[PDB]
Structures are given as C-alpha cells and as structure tokens.
Symmetry: C3
Subunit: 340 residues, 3 copies
C-alpha cells in the first residue's frame, strides 16, 4: 500500500479525544490517541513493545497510558516510565514509537513519517475554524474507498449538480465559469455560477430569498489531501468579498489502501448565533457528504477490481482539470517517497 508518510494528516477532531484513548488507523498504522492530564494530545503506536497489546485499550495511570496486558506505563513521548515486574528495569527496547502531533485550527495533525522531518510550518492553514467571526460545525465519517476517490470528488464540486441534485441543483449550471490556478504545492479550482435562481441550499442560506443570485464554489487543495472550499451566494452582480459564505473544511486521511477518514466542516460568516442554521448545515453534511457521496465512491471502489483487470482508463471531461492536476501531484509525491 503506497502512502505519502512524510506529511501532516488529520488523525482526529479534538472533540473526539479525551483521557480515554481512541484507537484509529492512519496510513495502515494503528495509533492510540489521547489527551494527557495537562491537556496536550499524545499519539503512540497502538502496539505495546512487550507483547503487542493495544495500549488504546488501556487507562491512564498517573497521567501515563498503561498497557492493559501486563501494565507497562508510557508517557506522551512513548518513554516507558514504569515496569512493575522484577527489578523494574526499563531499557530502551521498552519504549514505544510516538508520533509528532500539532493541535491547530480545531484539528489534530499527526506526522506518520520520519519525525525528524515534521515541520509545523508545513501544516495547512485552516484558521477560519477557530476564528470567532466564523461559526464552525462539522464532524467525522468513515468511508470504504481509497482517499483519492474522495479527492477527485471534492476537486470537481460540479458533481453536486447530480449527486446532490435535491439540494444543490442550479438552473445556471450550463453557464459555469471554471478557472484553475496552480501554486507550488497548492491548486485552486474556482467556479462561478452566474445569474441563476439560488439552489434549495443557497435559498436556505439566504433565508428563502428567491430572486436571482451569483454563486461561487471554489476549492483549494494542499498536499497531500487537505482541502478548503468557499461556498458563497449573493444577489446577482454583487462583489464576491461581500458575499455571505461558508469556508468548508474537507480533509481526508487514508486508513487502509481501500478505506479512509473524512473530516468535514462548515465555517460560515452568516447566521452565527442560529441553531436552526446549524441544523441546516449538519443536515447537508449528513445527507450529502456522508450518504450520497459515500454511495458513489464506495461503488466506484467496488469496481476497481474489474477496471484494473480489464485495463480500463478514465475518460476525461472539461470539468476534470483541477482533479487531474491534484491526482498527478499526489502520484508524483508517492513516487518521490518510494525511494526509499
């Protein structure tokens, strides 16, 4: 299974973690994730160095994670800080691997690769998630597809015209303007849908207003698989900076080669103290991101065996440029790492 290990991935949302460890597998690597008594999150390889028991089934003793099996204790650095057996000696072999963790932007980032290379400067900017001018809601979902399929999905936001048609269909779709801007290690796909009546969901954003709007659906990608979109609507022929908008957290982390973690969110500048608009956004997230898109990408994954065995290649359309560029960047990184 080929992953890009030397990169930061979101392993969890902060709300997911506590002093009770969470066992989760990223890049085929099982982790025990917990918040220590002092509040700082730790991430240990979920395999006790003694007999390979899951430490994530342990409990904290003295703020140290204790193996459930024979009770070796570890700090957040993976250092064995107590051995209860015999003379109680703790040689270097008893230490477990620890992973660099940065909690930032209401995300838990982890470096699954060479820890000497982990550079917090390199973590993607998701500042809107902690910016008090934005209201942020979201969650986690597990999907039985290769993460790359969900990168494809998200880098062609036009799929929403069909996959999400009940919420997202617009009658101005055939007037789409699409631009792609390639950075170094960053790619923006911009869409302007001009002059239409708002979609069901943009209508909700606007509290019903039925009259013609402009809508923008931009998405930004940073390596390996972390995306931030810009979903905006505004009376036709108004500035884009002045629009009500959602900045959408859409971050994938591989679990196995054929399964992945999906961390999604909306950070919105409108209806900031409105629980019902919270519910609208979490509704959308539940139906669109976690069912509708799940159904499509999970079915594509099930067809991978046929595609491969019959040497089938995709046929590309005008909507594909951003997703293909991103795909070729991920491949390029994969291949760099594969030596060695």
């Amino acid at each position: 299974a080929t992953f890009v290990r030397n990169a930061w991935y979101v392993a969890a949302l902060p709300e997911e973690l506590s002093e009770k460890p969470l066992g989760r597998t990223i890049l085929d690597t099982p982790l025990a994730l917990y918040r220590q008594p002092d509040g700082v999150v730790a991430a240990l390889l979920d395999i006790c160095p003694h007999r390979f028991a899951p430490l994530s089934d342990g409990i904290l003793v003295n703020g140290h994670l204790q193996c459930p099996y024979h009770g070796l204790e570890f700090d957040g650095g993976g250092q064995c800080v107590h051995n209860p057996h015999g003379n109680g000696a703790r040689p270097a072999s008893l230490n477990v691997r620890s992973f660099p963790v940065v909690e930032r932007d209401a995300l838990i980032w982890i470096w699954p690769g060479d820890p000497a290379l982990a550079d917090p400067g390199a973590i993607p900017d998701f500042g809107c998630r902690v910016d008090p001018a934005y209201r942020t809601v979201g969650g986690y979902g597990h999907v039985d597809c290769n993460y790359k399929l969900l990168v494809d999905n998200l880098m062609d936001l036009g799929h929403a015209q069909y996959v999400h048609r009940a919420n997202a269909q617009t009658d101005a779709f055939d007037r789409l303007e699409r631009e792609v801007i390639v950075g170094d290690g960053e790619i923006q796909a911009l869409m302007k849908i001009p002059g239409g009546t708002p979609s069901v969901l943009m209508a909700k954003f606007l509290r019903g207003a039925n009259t013609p709007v402009d809508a923008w659906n931009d998405i930004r990608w940073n390596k390996v698989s972390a995306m931030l979109n810009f979903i905006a609507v505004a009376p036709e022929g108004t500035p884009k900076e002045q629009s009500i908008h959602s900045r959408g957290t859409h971050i994938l982390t591989p679990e196995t080669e054929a399964s992945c973690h999906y961390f999604f969110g909306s950070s919105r500048n409108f209806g900031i103290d409105d629980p019902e608009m919270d519910g609208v956004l979490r509704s959308w997230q539940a139906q669109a991101l976690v069912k509708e898109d799940k159904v499509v990408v999970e079915a594509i994954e099930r067809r991978r065996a046929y595609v491969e065995a019959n040497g089938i290649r995709p046929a590309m359309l005008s909507c594909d440029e951003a997703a293909v560029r991103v795909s070729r960047e991920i491949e390029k990184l994969e291949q760099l790492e594969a030596a060695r």
Copy 2:
C-alpha cells in the same frame, strides 16, 4: 475466475426489469439492466467511462440512462448521447460497453463474451414459457456456491442419457408409476421425469404423468425452467419456473410453484452446496477428486462438456 463467456446466459427475468435499472453481476462483469421507454431491454457495463460510477444507480432522462455522478447520458447501444460539460463534445471514448441482449421466452438472455460470436439463433428453446397452452410462473434465487454444483444437483435427481452438440438429455420413464401430489387430482399411470441441458447451464425438465401407455406429449405435465448463471467463481444466480398444462387457472397452485424451496432448492440442500463450496479449498490443496456413482452419468457428461468449453476458450 474460469467461465465460459462465449455463450448465452440469463441475466434477469423480464418482470425484474423496468425503467429503474437493476445492477447485477454475471461472470464477474457488472451490468446495468433496464427497459427503455419503447420497452426494449438494454444491458450496459455497469461502469461509467468517465470515472467508473454505477450507471445502475442512475435514472432515465428522455429515455437515456444518466450517470448519477456527472450526468453523462447513454443510449441502449452504449453510445454517449449527452455530455453536459464544457463544449458538450462526445468523443468515442465516452461510449460505454453494451452487451448483446435478447428478450425471448420470458427470459432476458445476455452474451458476456466475444460479441462477434453472439448468435441469437443459438439461444436455447424455452418456448413453453410464452405458449398460452401453458401456465408459467417462477422466480429468482441466489446461492453462494459455484454454479457447477447446482448443474450437478439438477442433472441428478427405464433410464436413458443421450448426448450431442451442446445438448444432453437425461430421460427417465417410471411405468406402473406413482403420481405426484400436485398432478394427483387431475386424473394406472406412467410417470416421466426427464431433463434437457444446453450449454452452458440452462436446463428444462419434464415432470409428467398419464394413463397407462399414453403419448407422453398428451400427459399431465410441467416443464421446469432451471437456469444457472455464474455471478462470481463462488456464487450464482438461479432462475426457476414451471410451465404447466393443468390447473392453468388455479392461483393457489401458482403460489407453491413460485416457491424457491418447493421448486428450486430446499433449505437443507442449499445448506449442503454452500458447505461443499467452503470445502473447495481443502479438496484442491489435497488433490481430492470426486468418486462417482452409477447415478452420476449425465452430470459427468455435462461436466466434461463444460470443461471442454473452458479449455477451448483458453487462449
């Protein structure tokens, strides 16, 4: 997967198909099966050319199946007839594979193999199924075993096995016979229980009873549809039914003759063939072969011809 792909297989019963596509895999090939607005059945490879989404999760748009993902639209021939995107150009690369498909004898036949070789004249004769001299009912079942195990079971049970070109017939007459319970009341007798196999796995039996020494064609009888189609190497689809010339207007009789367990496979035999399939690993690893009994003649013949069709297909 070793299949005989160059043959007609039943993919569906016509009553399973509508303008809402059915997704079904035959011989490790996923199909989208639907009826166009003029009623004609289309069979497409269930994998969109763009990014491989399941067309069978799509709906029709003006008679054309629309991909649920980014909206490419296809005709029954697999031609892409609409591309919503950009200049809306439809190069040959956007066409999806379409499979030869014939609706005939109230069955949907598909040719999953080399399409140049697909000859609808070679489709097995199940004509009793649309003969109004017969009352026809049946249904569909799925089994987690290799299809050859159910062909075996089916070709089993004055005798007579007669053998030819992709057809084998197994005949049994039982004179001074015993009447079946269903045909009981519609009259000693002669019984008949015959079965005809055509390649690769399509069978039609003949369960019959008459007064002593009657034309077997004039008997009280049922012709039973028993057609298997491989799904994976270790699973199959089973299409079953009966075409009867008695109680043609009794619907209670329809009910039992529509029973999977009454007509196709009792829970207890299903348990056995699926259990045989779980034993396949062990037998293969230990080079264990089956030991045949006298009653195995027809099965073995049919087995040998299938194997012959397999061997021919390589290369």
Copy 3:
C-alpha cells in the same frame, strides 16, 4: 499454515458429542465427530468422498453416519457400508478418511497427522479430570487468535494482575518468585506468592498462594492454583487443577478447552458457580479481548519486523514458544 500435525490434540469435550455429529475444524482439517451406539467416538473427514458434502450435517442410521446429500453410509473406520444407488456397489474409492481418536480423562484426543505414527502412549496425563476426589467443571471457547498467543497468555499468568484486576488482584504481586523447570517436552513454571492477603477469587474459596502451570507439547497445559493459611505445606492445600488446552483451528483462530478440577467443596453448587463465573469473565471474555486484539496487529508487526521486548515474567512462556517453533520447523523439514 504451519502446524505440528504429528501430535494429539483435543478436538472436543466428551459432553459435546452424541449421535448428532459435530463439525469442527482442527489444524485446517474439517472433522465430523460423533459417538456410535456402542459409545465409541469416531472422527471422519467432514467431506463426503462422493461430491464433498458435510457428513457432519447427516444423521446415524444403524450407528453409521449417513451423508445428507445422497445417503452413502460410513462406519467409524471410514469404510463405506452402504450405497443406495444402482447395484449398491461400494468400491474402495467411496471410503472416507477416519482419524485416530482416544477418549481419555474426559477429553477427546485426535491425531491429525501421519496415522502410522499415532501412539496413544504419548497423550498427556489429565487424570484429575476423572478422579472421584476432584470435582471438575468447565467448557469450550472459540478464540480468533493464533493458538500460540493463548499459550503465551496461559504461561505468563502474571497478567491476571492487570487483565483480571477484578478477581485476581493481589498486593503481594511485587513480591512474586517464579521458578522454571524444563524437562523433555514438558515445562513447569512454579510460583509461590507468600504472605499476602487473598485476591477476590482466593477468598471466595496472611495467606500463601501458588500458581504453577505445566505445559506439554504441543499446547496442553495443567495448572495448580492453591491457597492455605500462611505457614501451611503446599501439598495439604485446597486447590484447583486447571485444564487449559488449545487446539489450532486455522492459522489465526483456535479452540480452547478449560476446566477446574478442585479438591474442595466438591458437593457444593455455589462453588461450581464461582468457578464457572471466573471462567466466563476471565477466560472466555477478558483474555479473549486481549489476544484477539494482538492478532489484529500481526500484519503490522510482521510487515515492520518488530520483535517483542521480554520482561522478567516471560521465561516460561518464551521457553515454551521456542519449543513449539522447534517442533514446527522440524516438521516442515518435510
């Protein structure tokens, strides 16, 4: 994948068997186990020689197991004794493999290997199990781990401190003392846990206590759990002799036969309760959880070339492990 096939394994408890066959796989070999009308247990390959049906889904007819599919009948030797078809001929090709079986000590022992080599003399001694001075109770558990992970567990019984916290905790356990004796194909870990107050379990039946365990190849263990007022001779204790016997099912799953044979309270049904309760919670639940968890981590450990780091409690389990691997590779030496 790699098993020691030339050895005796427990395939069932006697009370699991009857005229209704049981299908059970040992060392990747599916068996049909049943008790004939004369009381004698037979073990056949659970694959009809005709078309491979599960004979274990069949019934006895005149004491002969009848294939459910087309009704061949077999004796306990695997001879075909009836063919209801055509002229009823029974060619030798219709016989099924029958495995050597010995019912001893309230266990059913099967030899899955080279049948020429099956010496019932080499079956381990669990005589306490049919001793009138002992009351024996236990049962069967299935586990989704490689059996060797459960040998490990049983040979280092100083996890009960943490895995079994609730029943088997003692403050004495920093004052353990653990002696290991190795004989030919037999290893004993001894231990006397002196001076300490009793765990929940030992109170339920200033105390001294002792967990010894005997391993015999391949994976058959008998333990000794005793307890007695501080000062008392080990040999005059009240104690349980614990049957802990594993049989591989597949490379990543096994069969566990556990029991207690106790010399105390032996008419006493409450005591049956306590002992069956421990077995349910400790053995078939808590230990289950840990070893199945470790099995799931095998892929990563092997892919990454991780070897375990051993501790002071680990001698017995390590010596046993090394002997199993020895036998395993010896046999792969074709």
